[PDB]
Chain length 330, copies 2
């Protein structure tokens, strides 16, 4: 039975590796690789791989009736991750055209495709799974209006299941998302530095005063918001509690030389959820342990270690470590 | 049925995303995706087949992978009726390109040459037999530099046996790793655009008549074979300059209607130019040495302009290359 529900995107990543980004009008040569991607699916695969039993993760997404769509369903079967990936006839499977420069910088163009069809009506049995789960996770790679439909289902599910926490990762930043409505049922908000800056309006660096002001602005309109986990890159992460503005700093874990940071944010969000869901069971206070800032901090230390291992390897989802390796480095 | 135009070059599956503006480094944006046939080698061979009266006079030489894209392009050539010896290899996948097209029309292109890097003479051991009976052989810059030089040696040996064979070299896209000096030494007709000509001499960035003399001068200085440089000037048309004498012929654009998509219009120009060049070498009292006359070169380029001018009124890379009757019809009204 599923305890972590990931509702989000699948994209087939088509990636060209170049020395430098081409400039406008320029034709350059590069090296090509194709791989499974999409922030929603990346986070579900990271959950399944870091979980002690992958059957506790559950991925919700929509793909096309094409080869890419067939291959990702077969891949989830091979991974042992339950899902209700619906194949639709309207659009092709989503993809992304990606340029990776030798510095590590990215350029990403997504063709959302079938991700634009993911609605609650496409997945009629979602409510039954959500009223028994601990975490539900969403990103910004499906359509804004369909995200709001899922928000309404989750809002109904949390009123029936008080143990459910909604983790919202606002990635990538999309100006057309109604963040106010999403935050009204969000329990833990997980932006990175640039995403937090675009959602605030007030350059390139988040200071302590800006992070407190963002928590205040977001929490003033939200009865559910309890924690903001700011992802700060080389600075690590900051957990700030709403109302009290209690803060915990969690540093970068340095496992070794950085080879490939692709997928490292999704691995962090996935690993973070795995440990959150486990701490809700390994605790006397129960799922109300997810209201204590030190529980959130321990999960983030766990996520930092797993993401820190991920950057010493290559291949996005193939870089997500074993549970034992994370246990060892902790 | 005997092949008269041999195109040795690349096939790329074009993977194209249409965006409002190019993303900046570290940015994720949304776009619209389309997949289509590309490769400068294959585009120019397909333009030949469509502008030719009988497509069997064109012949495409290229390498693709033993994958889906490779199977589809072999089948595609069959439906077009264009002979080829597309070799399928297991070393690499079929070549592709990841392309961003902004609403301005500007491109960003990254090529993964893939199986195009395996195209060597040894992969096509019977090429010499075809080249010694052909009129034109055409190459670009989308296979490997070292293998291009191997093909250059084959062509040098073919021209010594077939004095009617002419080498048309379109140096696209500009590659700093190409030994252009060695390629030009057996090139008969060189077809750069303004920027490609400027990069092959040592500059970066309209260049005037005194500048073009120095460029033609440098191109010809080490080549015993170079006879004409056809400068492609985009909306300004083209410019044919003879080596040694610098006789010049200007060939303006032919405007067919509202420009919709200039994608593939250089390749359509090169292909049509070769079709008409090959035809003028047959329709003449003086033999293939008609290809040594600057006015014959000019007539081939007038034909290529009309075909390119039609292609820019249509969308679709090689889908916008017109049929010969369409080219013949518009050439009549233009005269």
């Amino acid at each position: 039975t599923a305890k972590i529900v990931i509702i989000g995107s699948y994209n087939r990543d088509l990636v060209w590796y170049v020395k430098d980004f081409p400039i406008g009008g320029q034709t350059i040569n590069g090296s090509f690789a194709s791989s499974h991607g999409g922030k929603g699916s990346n986070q579900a695969i990271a959950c399944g791989k870091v979980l002690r039993d992958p059957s506790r993760a559950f991925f919700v997404g929509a793909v096309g009736k094409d080869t890419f769509g067939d291959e990702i369903l077969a891949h989830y079967r091979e991974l042992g991750i339950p899902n209700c990936i619906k194949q639709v006839s309207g659009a092709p499977t989503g993809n992304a055209g990606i340029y990776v420069a030798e510095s590590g910088e990215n350029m990403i163009v997504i063709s959302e495709g079938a991700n634009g069809m993911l609605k609650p009506s496409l997945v009629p049995d979602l409510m039954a799974v959500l009223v028994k789960a601990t975490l539900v996770v969403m990103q910004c790679e499906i359509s804004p209006d369909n995200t709001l439909l899922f928000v309404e289902v989750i809002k109904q599910a949390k009123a029936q299941n008080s143990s459910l926490r909604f983790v919202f990762n606002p990635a990538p930043y999309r100006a057309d998302y109604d963040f106010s409505k999403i935050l009204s049922i969000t329990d833990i908000f997980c932006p990175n530095e640039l995403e937090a800056l675009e959602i605030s309006g007030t350059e390139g660096i988040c200071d302590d005063s800006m992070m407190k002001a963002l928590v205040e602005k977001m929490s003033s309109l939200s009865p559910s918001l309890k924690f903001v986990l700011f992802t700060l890159g080389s600075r690590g992460s900051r957990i700030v509690q709403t109302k009290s503005y209690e803060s915990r700093t969690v540093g970068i874990y340095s496992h070794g030389r950085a080879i490939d940071t692709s997928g490292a944010g999704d691995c962090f969000i996935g690993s973070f959820c795995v440990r959150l869901m486990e701490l809700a069971e390994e605790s006397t206070r129960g799922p109300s342990a997810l209201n204590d800032i030190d529980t959130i901090a321990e999960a983030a230390r766990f996520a930092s270690v797993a993401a820190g291992i991920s950057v010493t390897r290559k291949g996005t989802s193939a870089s997500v470590p074993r549970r034992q390796e994370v246990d060892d480095a902790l």
